[PDB]
Design an enzyme around this catalytic site. Structure first.
Site, mmCIF file in Angstrom:
data_model
loop_
_atom_site.group_PDB
_atom_site.id
_atom_site.type_symbol
_atom_site.label_atom_id
_atom_site.label_comp_id
_atom_site.label_asym_id
_atom_site.label_seq_id
_atom_site.Cartn_x
_atom_site.Cartn_y
_atom_site.Cartn_z
ATOM 1 N N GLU A 38 52.026 3.374 -13.417
ATOM 2 C CA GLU A 38 50.782 4.145 -13.847
ATOM 3 C C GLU A 38 50.393 4.059 -15.067
ATOM 4 O O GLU A 38 49.108 3.726 -15.246
ATOM 5 C CB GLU A 38 51.178 5.655 -13.609
ATOM 6 N N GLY B 217 52.785 11.525 -5.801
ATOM 7 C CA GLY B 217 51.716 11.944 -4.936
ATOM 8 C C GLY B 217 51.049 10.589 -4.194
ATOM 9 O O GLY B 217 51.193 10.271 -2.673
ATOM 10 N N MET C 119 49.379 6.419 -5.204
ATOM 11 C CA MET C 119 49.019 5.332 -6.368
ATOM 12 C C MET C 119 48.240 4.134 -5.800
ATOM 13 O O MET C 119 48.824 3.610 -4.956
ATOM 14 C CB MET C 119 50.321 5.018 -7.024
ATOM 15 N N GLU C 120 47.006 4.159 -6.622
ATOM 16 C CA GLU C 120 46.313 2.861 -6.245
ATOM 17 C C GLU C 120 47.052 1.747 -6.496
ATOM 18 O O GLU C 120 47.563 1.290 -7.559
ATOM 19 C CB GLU C 120 44.761 2.945 -6.828
ATOM 20 N N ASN C 121 47.183 0.697 -5.496
ATOM 21 C CA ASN C 121 47.535 -0.663 -5.856
ATOM 22 C C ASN C 121 46.940 -1.607 -4.993
ATOM 23 O O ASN C 121 46.006 -1.300 -4.120
ATOM 24 C CB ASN C 121 49.226 -0.666 -5.375
ATOM 25 N N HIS D 177 40.656 8.074 -0.669
ATOM 26 C CA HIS D 177 40.720 8.190 -2.092
ATOM 27 C C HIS D 177 41.239 6.938 -2.636
ATOM 28 O O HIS D 177 40.495 6.350 -3.586
ATOM 29 C CB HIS D 177 41.463 9.378 -2.742
ATOM 30 N N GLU D 178 42.487 6.339 -2.304
ATOM 31 C CA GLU D 178 42.889 5.292 -2.392
ATOM 32 C C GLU D 178 42.140 4.155 -2.132
ATOM 33 O O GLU D 178 42.202 2.890 -2.806
ATOM 34 C CB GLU D 178 44.320 5.107 -2.249
ATOM 35 N N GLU E 97 39.416 7.377 -11.816
ATOM 36 C CA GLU E 97 39.751 8.198 -10.625
ATOM 37 C C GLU E 97 38.363 9.128 -10.259
ATOM 38 O O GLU E 97 37.860 9.117 -9.072
ATOM 39 C CB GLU E 97 40.753 9.366 -11.222
#
EC number: 3.4.11.14
Lengths: 864, 324, 48, 48
Positions: free
Chosen positions: A130, A266, A268-270, A302-303, A325
């Site tokens: 993060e 929850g 995590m964007e990757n 969302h991601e 975000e």
């Protein structure tokens, strides 16, 4: 805080990373090709957990110079690899044989617990970076500004499955041992270090090719493919939506959406392996409702939004993190609007974040969204619900103010401008201004500068077919008296909307001045023109009495959009403190809700009216407000009936639950008797109804129930096994009223600590059960302060607990009393919220002294 | 198996415990009821072959403990010791060749002040010790240290006073020692040290030095640059010539010279007023200077030399040494 | 175990009392019957 | 070595003039002692 000297800029990475399960250890090679722009003998590598074995730097083609530097600035998470000779300038390669470990703090490259269908409680290796976490896993330049390409290669047992950012391009054998193989992936494009991700575990393959061709894939453990099928369809529908949206190809030929058992973060964007929480992602068809499907669609999109804003153009520094975000969040809603039109999502969206945006800015600690950051540790406390909600609200503001096509062009130009390059918020404003022409940055600079939303004293001047009036910009205050030492006025682009077309704003002005004039052609002498439109403008429009009366017929029927009606309803309740008339007008808008069928309107109306009922404790006469609630709920309770009705949706199930619960709160005699009837039928087992009705039935029966029903409730909780059903039972049994009963249920809340860390919600329910009983429970938890703090050591749960407990107080004397109590009992993590609540209480007191007494007189007019 | 009243009295009086055993169950249970314990030493394999530490968990209630010893060949450091080390001071860990994984667990220990990884076969610095900010005495004995550059990280520490490297295979001494200032009692004997740089000598707070049992060939004059040395030892080293400049340094209570090469003791020994003990064995010497008797605190037994060299002294000087 | 005239003598004469018990039952009940007692340095496992 | 809470009880003994919490492990100065004015000797020995 110091960032990095950045004497060497990384170019390419080669990471033959080897996780060692059953030992929780980690090996690697870390061969990074970089460019030494600054002629220095020292190399700065931010990294904390790694223990370097050997290091060697070979510049260009000559031999390496090994390493003679290992300064471990552990507190700064820095390491200095000094060398005997100068490194001048040129392209070189640093090979760093090292060691690390799978931490148990669920950080960097940790190990997560998972259970096979047979059991075995095995462990898996998972990643999440993060902020300042990639450096903990393996040493790099952990800086968002730093951008380089990576070639991740894993040394994984062949039985285990391994995924990374890119597609697999080689599966060679491992020469040292044949129980594991070397999996080499493709070269990642230019990307940030914290966005790197690779996981190793035991899952099953579920693929789905898209219209574009990219195979969106999910890897649920135990091959629960079905659980993960709806999200596959949602992604396969929304990714091509993005592709045709901004006409930019997806970066990664492969996209994965794996879930992890208790991710504890929850989501995590990757880059192409966005990880999810199991509960958030998978959906059992028989263990879920349509609202849960709506939530999972929201989170999965969302991601995917983060895949574009984020990955492609990373924020320059954490100061702009709020955008990466926030903006994305709003985008996601638009996506679902184009995916499930039957799922009218803006309606609950206004109630989803916008409400706490409004209520949180009203209070203190309303710091502006854009706060300068030097240290990544500051991210935690510069972060709050405001950072998401207000950011999404203002970005949606911008989309409306710009127009859909113009915003499209601006976003496309911005993405094509700084693709794979760090960009600042000002760069986005510049690109938007280039696309449109009107100054966005001229508003964004103030939006970063100040803190909060304005107000307008609207007017009424209907000159024939011109409804001109004078909008007056001023700062908002929760009590009403804003500080206003600085310039309180703003330049919010309040987009008026003609009410003749509910969705189309025939008249719409991009007003951005403290004073202005109107230009319009009125259609009807009572056009009930809707200021703003579906609360797209994050704002608290104060309508004049003439405006309210003119729009009253519009809200009596369903002509006004439900979003407008709920926004006005929320505005009036907040404006009871600042705007005049308040209760008197409040009553009139209540009349409109004689005909409102919308569920969200009923939900936030019930929230507001429960706030009033709990708040009116000190001056009593609950029977009058409860009678008014019964008057409001008569047509609704009749139309919904009592029993389940044919044609009822899940929204209608929430409707029946709320209406039954609040009718019992009012205390209707026939409703209470029928609720007791069904209570007896269920406890006897002769007829057991749905839990959705059952829990509000428990609340209603205990609202006027004795201790025997309380013991029966405890019993039913004991044989009950479903965790959230028991939680609902506990929170509704907290709603007893008899003083002996409330003391007993307090001691039984000490008994109901069985629920793991759900004790906080149970005791929040018991605190919210009564109003004077709330004060008694506050004294009780004063007597049990140490127990609560030893059950929760400075967590968000205890802050939610205290906020729930003290929210119903409206007396300044005991406000100071509880303030001194908190002073003697420091809770730094909740500290902000603490004073927040305190100020809220004070405001509550003031509001009472404003109108409570006159409320009696209004009731004298109601019954007359 | 102590009886209850004696158990209570022991709980109120006992300070140090030294448990040695062979089997795991051999350890008494009641020892964990002790509450005024500060010194605990364990001898005998604690390895329970996975799912271990069930016995050791009693250390949770031994909150008064201050020093702990683990001579039990632990593959991994226990979680119990890291939990209890909040208030703990000394980890005397001896693995007898067992490889111990630090796993950053020492980072939890902050009040710790002395650490000794003995025969733990690290082969490298743990790199987690640098997190500790109250450490003063560190000991890495018999751990096969080849290159030890990571000692530069010690400049972050400020309470450090003694760096111990009793046995290792260090070849080249890092120059980055020059940054270290507060260390005093470095003991890096028994190592494959060919030469000593001036970088060690940039330090000025050195009290004790142990450059012995190595492959040293010559002594730089910068030893005399040190002005705080008390005890020195260059035993078992190929020291052809002793520089006179070393003799500038005063306050040399002792000075070991054993198993050295043919040499010639300078008369500047007269400026060794603080000398009390000295050895001159294992080195080809023929004429001890008369200024040896100049030393005021030098005893016949204090000066350890071969009898013939003792004879080469003037007879009156021999009498003076004898009567001492 | 103690006798009534001894209780009396303790009543007008005893000043301070020390008690250490391994278990609760070791504590005599008549200790509370004292009135002139001013010091009681109890020790044991009275947590009960 | 065990934890204790004043729970505002100490404010009741107005005549108390000498207090100590030996090995009582409070990790925090209790607020109850403040209201009492008669104290002369105070010890918080070994309370982390």
């Amino acid at each position: 805080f110091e960032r990095l000297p950045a004497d060497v800029s990384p170019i390419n990475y080669s990471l033959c990373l080897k996780p060692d399960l059953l030992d929780f250890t980690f090996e690697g090679k870390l061969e990074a090709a970089a460019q030494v722009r600054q002629a220095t003998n020292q190399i700065v590598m931010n990294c904390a957990d790694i223990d370097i074995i050997t290091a060697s730097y070979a510049p260009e083609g000559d031999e390496e110079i090994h390493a003679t530097g290992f300064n471990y600035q552990n507190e700064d998470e820095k390491v200095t690899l000094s060398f005997p000779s100068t490194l001048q300038t040129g392209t070189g390669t640093l090979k760093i044989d090292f060691v690390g470990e799978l931490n148990d703090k669920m950080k960097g490259f940790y190990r997560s617990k998972y259970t096979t269908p047979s059991g075995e409680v095995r462990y898996a290796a998972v990643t999440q970076f993060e902020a300042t976490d990639a450096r903990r896993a393996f040493p790099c330049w952990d800086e968002p500004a730093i951008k380089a390409t990576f070639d991740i290669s894993l040394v994984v047992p062949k039985d285990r499955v391994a995924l990374s950012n890119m597609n697999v391009i080689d599966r060679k054998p491992y020469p040292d041992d044949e129980n594991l193989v070397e999996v080499k992936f493709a070269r990642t494009p230019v990307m940030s270090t914290y966005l790197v991700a690779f996981v190793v575990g035991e899952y099953d393959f579920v693929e789905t090719r898209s219209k574009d061709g990219v195979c969106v894939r999910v890897y649920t453990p135990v091959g629960k493919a079905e659980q993960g099928k709806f999200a596959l369809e949602v992604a396969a529908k929304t990714l091509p939506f993005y592709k045709d949206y901004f006409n930019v190809p997806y970066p990664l030929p492969k996209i994965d959406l794996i879930a992890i058992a208790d991710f504890a973060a929850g989501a995590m964007e990757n880059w192409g392996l966005v990880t999810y929480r199991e509960t958030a992602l998978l959906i059992d068809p028989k263990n879920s409702c349509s609202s849960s499907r709506q939530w999972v669609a929201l989170v999965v999109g969302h991601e995917l939004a983060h895949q574009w804003f984020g990955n492609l153009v990373t924020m320059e520094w954490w100061t702009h993190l709020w955008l990466n975000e926030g903006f994305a969040s709003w985008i996601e809603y638009l996506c679902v609007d184009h995916c499930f039109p039957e799922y009218d999502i803006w309606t609950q969206f206004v109630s989803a974040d916008y409400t706490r945006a409004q209520e949180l800015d009203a209070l203190d600690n309303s710091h502006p969204i854009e706060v300068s950051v030097g240290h990544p540790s500051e991210v935690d406390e510069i972060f709050d619900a405001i950072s998401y909600s207000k950011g999404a609200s203002v970005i949606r503001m911008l989309h409306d103010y710009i127009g859909d096509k113009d915003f499209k062009k601006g976003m496309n130009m911005y993405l094509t401008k700084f693709q794979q390059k760090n960009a600042a918020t000002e760069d986005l404003w510049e690109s938007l201004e280039n696309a449109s022409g009107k100054p966005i940055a001229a508003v964004m600079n103030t939006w970063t500068k100040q803190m909060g939303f304005p107000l307008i004293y609207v007017e009424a001047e209907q000159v024939e077919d011109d409804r001109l009036l004078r909008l007056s910009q001023k700062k908002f205050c929760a009590g009403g008296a804003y500080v206003g030492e600085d310039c309180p006025q703003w330049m919010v682009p309040i987009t008026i909307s003609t009410s003749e077309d509910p969705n189309q704003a025939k008249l719409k002005i991009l007003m951005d001045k403290p004073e202005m004039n109107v230009v319009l052609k009125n259609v009807k002498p009572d056009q009930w023109v809707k200021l703003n439109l579906g609360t797209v403008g994050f704002y608290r429009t104060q309508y004049s009495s003439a405006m309210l009366e003119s729009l009253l017929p519009g809200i009596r029927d369903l002509s006004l959009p439900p979003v407008d009606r709920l926004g006005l309803q929320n505005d009036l309740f907040s404006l009871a403190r600042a705007g005049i008339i308040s209760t008197v007008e409040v009553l009139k808008v209540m009349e409109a809700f004689v005909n409102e069928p919308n569920y969200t309107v009923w939900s936030d109306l019930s929230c507001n009216l429960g706030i009033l009922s709990t708040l009116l404790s000190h001056t009593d006469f609950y029977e009058e407000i409860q009678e008014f609630v019964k008057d409001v709920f008569s047509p609704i309770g009749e139309r919904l009936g009592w029993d389940p009705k044919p044609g009822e949706g899940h929204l209608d199930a929430l409707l029946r639950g709320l209406v039954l619960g609040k009718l019992g709160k009012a205390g209707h005699k026939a409703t209470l008797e029928e609720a007791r009837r069904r209570f007896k039928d269920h406890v006897e087992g002769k007829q057991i109804l749905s839990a959705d009705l059952r829990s509000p039935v428990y609340l209603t029966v205990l609202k006027h129930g004795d201790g025997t029903t309380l013991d029966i409730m405890l019993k039913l909780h004991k044989q009950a096994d479903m965790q959230e059903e028991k939680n609902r039972i506990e929170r509704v049994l907290g709603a007893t009223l008899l003083p002996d009963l409330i003391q007993k249920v307090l001691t039984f809340a000490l008994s109901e600590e069985v629920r793991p860390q759900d004790t906080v919600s149970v005791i929040g329910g018991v605190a919210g059960g009564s109003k004077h009983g709330r004060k008694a429970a506050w004294k009780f938890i004063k007597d049990n302060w140490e127990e609560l703090y030893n059950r929760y050591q400075g967590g968000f749960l205890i802050s939610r607990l205290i906020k729930l407990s003290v929210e119903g107080f409206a007396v300044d004397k005991m406000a100071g009393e509880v303030k001194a109590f908190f002073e003697s009992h420091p809770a730094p993590s909740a500290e902000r919220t603490i004073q927040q609540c305190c100020e809220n209480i004070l405001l509550n007191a003031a509001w009472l002294k404003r109108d409570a007494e006159s409320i009696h007189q209004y009731l004298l007019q109601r019954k007359a | 198996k102590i009886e209850a009243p004696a158990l209570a009295f022991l709980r109120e009086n006992l300070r140090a415990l030294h448990i040695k055993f062979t089997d795991i169950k051999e350890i008494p249970l009641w020892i964990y009821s002790l509450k005024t314990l500060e010194e605990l030493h364990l001898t005998g394999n604690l390895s329970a072959e996975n799912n271990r530490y069930i016995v050791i968990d009693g250390l949770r209630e031994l909150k008064r403990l201050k020093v702990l010893r683990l001579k039990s060949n632990l593959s991994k450091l226990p979680q119990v010791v890291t939990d209890v080390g909040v208030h703990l001071q000394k980890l005397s860990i001896n693995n007898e060749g067992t490889k111990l994984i630090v796993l950053n667990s020492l980072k939890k220990m902050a009040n710790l002040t002395e650490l000794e990884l003995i025969r733990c076969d690290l082969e490298r610095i743990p790199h987690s010790i640098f997190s500790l900010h109250n450490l003063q005495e560190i000991d890495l004995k018999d751990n096969n240290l080849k290159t030890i550059e990571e000692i530069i990280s010690f400049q972050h520490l400020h309470r450090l006073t003694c760096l111990k490297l009793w046995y290792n295979h260090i070849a080249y001494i890092p120059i980055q020692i020059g940054n270290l200032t507060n260390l005093e009692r470095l003991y890096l004997n028994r190592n494959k040290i060919e030469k000593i740089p001036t970088q060690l000598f940039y330090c000025r707070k050195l009290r004790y030095l142990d450059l012995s049992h190595n492959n040293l060939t010559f002594l730089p004059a910068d030893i005399g640059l040190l002005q705080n040395l008390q005890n020195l030892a260059i035993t078992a080293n190929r020291i052809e010539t002793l520089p006179p400049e070393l003799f500038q340094c005063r306050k040399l209570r002792a000075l070991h010279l054993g198993n050295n090469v043919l040499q010639s003791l300078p008369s500047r020994v007269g400026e060794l007023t603080n000398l009390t003990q000295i050895e001159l064995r294992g080195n080809r010497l023929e004429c001890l200077p008369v200024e040896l008797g100049e030393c005021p605190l030098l005893k016949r037994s204090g000066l350890v030399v071969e009898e013939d060299l003792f004879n080469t002294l003037p007879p009156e000087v021999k009498e003076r040494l004898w009567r001492a």
